[PDB]
Ligand binder design. Structure first.
Ligand SMILES: NC[C@H](O)c1ccc(F)cc1
Ligand SMILES: [Cl-]
Ligand SMILES: [Cl-]
Ligand SMILES: [Cl-]
Ligand SMILES: [Cl-]
Ligand SMILES: [Mg+2]
Lengths: 137, 140
């Protein structure tokens, strides 16, 4: 672990916890999230992101908790990283648009939702993005 | 790297939150980074761009400079990841997608590269960038 702290590497890189156990921890983090146990979900998603900062779903989980907690800028920061780590997935850009509206930045929000509609292949996501655009003055 | 610093900062105030370095000094450091870069001092330029990306990671100009350095150094995955951050932050052109396409071709991912270059041709209003993208598509 110390070596990974000094070399900047992840705990996942050194197989510090077996993979099936990490799956279980992610499932439990999601259970806490779905049950509204936000404090515990936050601990578990922070734990996961320490373990593997390059895991898009771990990042997205922590970003979602920050958004629920109305830490909108912190959520938007993580969503930008999640977009870069993902597989052509514009869901983090969609949630960034929601964060920008809550930050009273509607032109930034519009740009996010427009990006989703122009580049995403996720039809359900684009429908949602369009509904936000429909509402944005 | 820069991305791990961004994530650690979010997991765990930061220097940016306290305005620890004023905008005019950051502008100067950015200029100094390109001076090193332009002279072939790419290791020093990398340090300066890493410094900028520690202070203000969500700045497209800092991210694009560092991504270019990684691409020149043939750290293609790191470059691609940073280019994508610049796009998500709203970089006002498709050059991050174009250069990601180049990175993906060097990573032996020609289908990912094709999607990048097709996105450029479909959406860029830069006619010269579109010809460059089309030339890659012709070869893939
Ligand atoms: N297939 C293109 C991919 O979604 C993508 C790669 C890089 C980028 F800057 C934006 C988008
Ligand atoms: Cl915040
Ligand atoms: Cl929200
Ligand atoms: Cl705005
Ligand atoms: Cl462009
Ligand atoms: Mg920050």
């Amino acid at each position: 672990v110390i070596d990974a702290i000094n070399s900047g590497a992840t705990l996942k890189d050194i197989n510090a916890i077996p993979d099936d156990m990490m799956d279980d921890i992610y499932s439990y983090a999601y259970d806490f999230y779905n049950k509204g146990r936000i404090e515990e979900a936050e601990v578990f998603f922070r734990f996961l992101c320490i373990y593997d900062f390059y895991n898009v779903d771990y990042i997205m989980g922590l970003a979602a908790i920050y958004q629920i907690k109305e830490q909108f800028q912190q959520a938007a920061d993580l969503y930008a990283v999640a977009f870069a780590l993902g597989k052509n997935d514009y869901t983090p850009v969609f949630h960034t648009g929601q964060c920008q509206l809550r930050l009273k930045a509607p032109l930034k929000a519009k740009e996010c939702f427009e990006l989703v509609i122009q580049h995403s292949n996720d039809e359900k996501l684009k429908i949602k993005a369009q509904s936000y655009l429909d509402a944005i003055q």
